[PDB]
């Protein structure tokens, strides 16, 4: 894996520094470099393919080492070296492909392919050259045991799930209460709703509590906490619980009260926020629960006291909602995010290549089964693919 | 010394950079090293072989 | 091109390594590319400026090297090499500035401006140093004539449109069935509707399709599918397709049925998605084909069942919704995403210096026109001024 | 700042270029800075902690230089260099922890710990390295008195603010007209409402006007705007004013008549678009002012008119809305943005180690007050933690 | 692919060139040429097939030099040549059908065989001589991103499309008004009917257009445009839009007046011609817009009154017709057409080897899909296989 | 005429014989030709256009002569090359545009530009080359 980054590395700084007209000064390191990876690779044979459709490929390597005897690089040089770049970018391309379409239900960390396997052997350590990037970086202090840790923006965290609690209901669904929620991605949006408004309730106050626990730990997240929850404020027919019937929210929406919004740390309050709407801050948690009320208005205009009225007609429905986005989060197991496009490469080259269904990834590399169970073998492959991934991602656009 | 050898040359007394031809009456420029001369500072304008 | 971008990178580099008390060691080669630069430009003579309100103005190049034989740079070292720079980069940005407001119809991806013209010469090839950035990179790689690519958070693919399409309609509007649409930015939101709950509808069933073709091929993406067009979802009046009169949308929101989502590329589906929401990858793809079914309910509670009858009365319209976001993307050609400001930078150039509309790009580079009528001209030249806004906020800010 | 800047930077070079293997012509000026760096700090006592719950920390150097005399560097080489790095990286993070958690009303660019004033003395100069980031070319910059600038994604410009005005109103609530809006972050919501639907307004038009003053100056940024405020299109019980009554708001939507948004500098009209929406740019600005009108339909379907009668009940209110998404944009000052973290990260410090209120930030680092009134003194307080901590994240995570 | 043209070129060179009877001094550059191809080649094995039906054969070159001793050629000499050059021609056959076989989404220009990926390499350039021809011509030129122009007699550039357009119906189909039209290779036809014969249109006149745009923009087009429509002025019965039944079309040819012929490019009017037929040229154009108008006779003599009535009985109905054909053109991009043979050999070495369906291509290289869907990677793709076609003509009779 | 075919025969030679890696006894011949050119070129001044919209262009010729490889040519050799057939190239499309543009009622067959008429010249003879189109 270092070994394959530091090739990559070596060929995106050879296409990127070696131009024609350029001071030798300005590539000199790098020409050392390119030419300890030549010697390296050379008289060497790799084998990549021969999973699902993706072909099967011979890499020989039998190349002349770059020149060092210029002052400024002219069309020769650039020429020279372009072909063993190319040649070396399709061999990094390949063996990236061959070894993130692989899994493992054991050791998925370690090297799936064979040509990773060879790079892995002694005999090419000479190339590492500087292992800049954030994921081969994380990959080097994970394989220290050290703390890693990836900036995610947006990160996708919650497996989409809509779904409602019926704590008050009955056959005809007349007089619910309960709560509606809605995690995808990044966001929470969850409306406590009650068809009675709180009329029979004690103090006229309806709780309402939405757990939502993370399957990682997330470190120094920005969150935007809003007090409604759009999604859950317009007309809806909605499917019983056991999906034998329909029934009608017509909601009206009220200001949430007494909202409380805790990060859990292994069930220890680490941050509370109380009546603070905007952007906040948690620093380390892996639970969400937030806490807030429907409280009957005390004093209502004739337009609202129609709306609520005592009795079993209840037209229009008392709602109360929250929405809460993670714009930002650091964890120490990696995941899919807005920003990034490691699991879209993944899941497109397995896509491409009709990799067959194996034994770690669920099919297709479905995120939201992949996040809901997370399995720490599922952890050791996303990881070692998207760092492939990322090595691949350096030379190929 | 590569940086400074083209000053170096330049400063140099007993030898010129080169000599433009030009087939055409030009003005002897007027110098402070000596009244008049066919001190050309750049060959701008003429092939150069 | 590759000479400005070296001049950008070598007075960037200067402002960040020429620091004081730091080694020379650091610096060494950055000090080398630096003469190299200042050797090249000496006595030669450029012009900007002359269009619109940009000034016109003559820069001379007669300076003296820098020094490379102290250990560790100190106060004069620094002094000495800003006084340069501030020239440099005053020359560059005029140059960018001069480059960015000018346009061509005919080879829009060759410089326009004669200073860029006097730089594509051979002479100063010899200031290239380094291709590194995102842009450069990809204009040297469609030089070289190999693939390339721009990552895109939230890419600006889709032309702004928000319109309806009523497929079952009468004079008053009472008795509707159609879809309504916004494809903005990143986003499509579309809406079926029908008034009748497709009581009289075969199987109860009323499908709707709509189809969104980009100008561009997109790789890699991943997209947010989710089930409501939370924007379709309330009460709404319209003005009708001609204009004569207005009509009512009172939609009350249904579960989406039998939900489709088909990627295709020259026709052909590359992905398909049946009943999933969350986040989707789509690999190659210039169309996106959404296919969902108003199913009526079989069974009703009464509050349900009276919302729909078998009359013309129609209080409440039954609409089903989707919405789709591309969160990421890949693509060959240049676009606006929400993340990079080179779109920006050469709409407030061209508006701060009152460019007088020219043959190729839109009024006011308004990017719906742009990405409406994106023709081979336009992407050129808009790949052109795009990579020298970048060139150009390498050092300007 | 600079010192710490260049330890930090040095110290994320030595753990990313010298790993076993890889050639010294790789790390041979790197490891000239580290010698420099252990022979300035060699000999030296620092101090850190003591405020809050931070720890009192006590830090002596006393390191031996890494050697020089190796081609391919070994196990041996990268071990103890690793021994070093691990200690100097433990001082960085504790001297930026300590310089975070503190502040001053007077001078607070000045460094605040006693270790960073320790630093800022003339010997430590000599590690000053390369000040490549954007926050410490930003640093050096506003220390010269020139130009800064900060990219950011949808940055955190609005303080939250969610309310309503009312230029019509009574004791019943049943009859009013004027505006909501939300702006939070980098979204304005707005949306104006007339309960009469401007039957009584001459020309049958009623005009909404939103004036939105940013507390800083941004330039070259990217506006989506859209015709409809999704937030104010469900029916709503909001409190009064004065939170004595409450009253129904229960709007349907008609399209935005004759909207213009126009961005302003210092009063003077810089930008404005008429009845334009999408993508948007808006190059130097302090003042959003969006006006728009409710023009009541000229024809209308019964379905329609029904809506709107003469008389006063009116049980549907028209409503006309705005949303105007800041998606990029580029700021003298420091600010918070989606994508990046150092308010996440300074925040969480000062929650960890609880540090009692000082004088300059608001209680809790809350965004929402500290960008409300972004006095100088809390813009230096703020620039000043939000460099430190970007130095630290560069680090750790 | 340059040089495999080159060996293609020499081989030729070598069969036409190398008689028996000539003198030495007509050939010996192309001896020297000779030799040097036979000295590059020896000592490399190469492999061509495996795909489809196409048989894995295996290439072994240990040659000996023609000889340059005589000063005309004999028997012998020219019977070890053709010896030579027999296996040599073979082996570039099958490169050539190996590589036409072959497609990729992903640079598409880029060799795929495994012999082209071989003969890639920088020892092979050494044998390169001269790229005389137009499709290798067209190929540096492209590499080299210039302007590309390949002469096209008759381009294929309209795909097959027989429709009709309906301005005016009814359930009955005995009142129409509208346009029929085939586009197919080089060849408009179309022609406007009205049954009616503009009896009530205003001015008795009524206007037909036809609109084609073009997939590629042709330059230097020399078009010949005929008054008449052959093609639909005969009896006809013809499915009705939806299918269900079928309509009667009983035409009556008129002149066309006022015929409009516009060459547009990106929406700008390059050419125009009025009321002008035979031979006329469009320069640069992508669109062709033909509008013509039916103008009722203002006098008729008997026979004609009998056939335009002013009751609706219309047993004969009025039609003027268009023809336009391009009988040769310029294109940048590369397009099958009736005098080349490329697209031909290509479609017959995947029929005959029974390729299977790949990525980028349609089934059967069809090209009416083909043109329907240009897309960059298939026109990449298109231009790679019919310059190895055109190389693999050079020899194979 | 003649002398414009020759200009361009060898213009076109140069471009589809001049390539990275070819034999230099492959072009010798052309390059003989091609310093011909260049030799008989240099120091003469020529105008073109000037009628309707096609601007008035000034081309002056101050080039060397292309050099000499052992064995085979490469890819310094072709960029400098390029060089000088670029701007020939040019020369000569301004140069065919120009005539192309004009007529003339009496010596219809006669040169009508500047250029072509300097071209006729006794002293651009020595580019003929083979006028095999
Ligand atoms: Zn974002």
Same mark, same amino acid.
């Given at each position: 894996?270092?070994?394959?980054?530091?090739?990559?590395? $070596?060929?995106?700084?050879?296409?990127?520094?070696?131009?024609?007209?350029?001071?030798?000064?300005?590539?000199? !390191?790098?020409? &050392?470099?390119?030419?300890?990876?030549?010697?390296?690779?050379?008289?060497?044979?790799?084998?990549?393919?021969?999973?699902?459709?993706?072909?099967?490929?011979?890499?020989?390597?039998?190349?002349?080492?770059?020149?060092?005897?210029?002052?400024?690089?002219?069309?020769?040089?650039?020429?020279?070296?372009? =072909?063993?770049?190319?040649?070396?970018?399709?061999?990094?391309?390949?063996?990236?492909?061959?070894?993130?379409?692989?899994?493992?239900?054991?050791?998925?960390?370690?090297?799936?392919?064979?040509?990773?396997?060879?790079?892995?052997?002694?005999?090419?350590?000479?190339?590492?050259?500087?292992?800049?990037?954030?994921?081969?970086?994380?990959?080097?202090?994970?394989?220290?045991?050290?703390?890693?840790?990836?900036?995610?923006?947006?990160?996708?965290?919650?497996?989409?799930?809509?779904?409602?609690?019926?704590?008050?209901? &009955?056959?005809?669904?007349?007089?619910?209460?309960? $709560?509606?929620?809605?995690?995808?991605?990044?966001?929470?949006?969850?409306?406590?709703?009650?068809?009675?408004?709180?009329?029979?309730?004690?103090?006229?106050?309806?709780?309402?509590? @939405?757990?939502?626990?993370?399957?990682?730990?997330?470190?120094?997240?920005?969150?935007?906490? *809003?007090? !409604?929850?759009?999604?859950?404020?317009?007309?809806?027919?909605?499917?019983?619980?056991?999906?034998?019937?329909?029934?009608?929210?017509?909601?009206?929406? *009220?200001?949430?009260?007494?909202?409380?919004?805790?990060? *859990?740390?292994?069930?220890?309050?680490? =941050?509370?926020?109380?009546?603070?709407?905007?952007?906040?801050?948690?620093?380390?948690?892996?639970?969400?629960?937030?806490?807030?009320?429907?409280?009957?208005?005390?004093?209502?205009?004739?337009?609202?006291?129609?709306?609520?009225?005592?009795?079993?007609?209840?037209? @229009?429905?008392?709602?109360?909602?929250?929405?809460?986005?993670?714009?930002?989060?650091?964890?120490?197991?990696?995941?899919?995010?807005?920003?990034?496009? *490691?699991?879209?490469?993944? $899941?497109?080259?397995?896509?491409?290549?009709?990799?067959?269904?194996?034994?770690?990834?669920?099919?297709?590399?479905?995120?939201?089964?992949?996040?809901?169970?997370?399995?720490?073998?599922?952890?050791?492959?996303?990881?070692?693919?998207?760092?492939?991934?990322?090595?691949?991602?350096?030379?190929?656009? | 010394?590569?940086?400074?050898?083209?000053?170096?040359?330049?400063?140099?007394?007993?030898?010129?950079?080169?000599?433009?031809?030009?087939?055409?009456?030009?003005?002897?420029?007027?110098?402070?090293?000596?009244?008049?001369?066919?001190?050309?500072?750049?060959?701008?304008?003429?092939?150069?072989?």
């Amino acid at each position: 894996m270092d070994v394959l980054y530091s090739l990559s590395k $070596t060929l995106k700084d050879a296409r990127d520094k070696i131009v024609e007209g350029t001071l030798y000064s300005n590539v000199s !390191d790098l020409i &050392q470099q390119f030419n300890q990876m030549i010697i390296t690779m050379n008289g060497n044979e790799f084998q990549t393919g021969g999973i699902g459709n993706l072909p099967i490929r011979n890499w020989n390597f039998n190349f002349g080492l770059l020149g060092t005897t210029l002052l400024n690089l002219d069309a020769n040089y650039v020429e020279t070296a372009r =072909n063993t770049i190319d040649y070396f970018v399709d061999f990094v391309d390949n063996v990236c492909m061959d070894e993130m379409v692989r899994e493992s239900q054991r050791n998925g960390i370690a090297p799936q392919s064979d040509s990773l396997r060879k790079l892995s052997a002694i005999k090419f350590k000479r190339i590492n050259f500087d292992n800049s990037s954030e994921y081969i970086e994380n990959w080097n202090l994970q394989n220290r045991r050290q703390r890693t840790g990836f900036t995610f923006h947006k990160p996708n965290i919650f497996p989409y799930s809509a779904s409602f609690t019926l704590n008050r209901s &009955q056959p005809a669904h007349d007089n619910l209460m309960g $709560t509606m929620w809605l995690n995808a991605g990044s966001e929470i949006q969850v409306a406590g709703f009650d068809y009675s408004c709180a009329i029979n309730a004690p103090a006229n106050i309806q709780q309402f509590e @939405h757990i939502v626990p993370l399957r990682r730990v997330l470190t120094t997240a920005t969150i935007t906490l *809003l007090p !409604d929850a759009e999604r859950f404020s317009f007309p809806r027919v909605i499917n019983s619980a056991d999906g034998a019937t329909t029934w009608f929210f017509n909601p009206v929406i *009220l200001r949430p009260n007494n909202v409380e919004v805790e990060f *859990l740390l292994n069930g220890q309050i680490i =941050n509370t926020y109380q009546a603070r709407f905007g952007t906040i801050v948690a620093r380390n948690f892996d639970t969400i629960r937030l806490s807030f009320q429907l409280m009957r208005p005390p004093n209502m205009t004739p337009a609202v006291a129609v709306l609520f009225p005592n009795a079993q007609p209840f037209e @229009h429905h008392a709602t109360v909602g929250l929405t809460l986005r993670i714009e930002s989060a650091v964890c120490e197991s990696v995941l899919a995010d807005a920003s990034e496009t *490691l699991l879209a490469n993944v $899941t497109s080259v397995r896509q491409e290549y009709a990799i067959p269904v194996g034994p770690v990834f669920p099919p297709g590399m479905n995120w939201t089964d992949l996040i809901t169970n997370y399995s720490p073998s599922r952890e050791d492959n996303l990881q070692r693919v998207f760092t492939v991934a990322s090595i691949r991602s350096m030379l190929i656009k | 010394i590569l940086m400074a050898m083209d000053q170096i040359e330049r400063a140099s007394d007993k030898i010129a950079q080169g000599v433009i031809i030009a087939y055409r009456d030009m003005q002897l420029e007027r110098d402070e090293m000596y009244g008049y001369v066919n001190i050309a500072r750049n060959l701008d304008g003429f092939q150069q072989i």
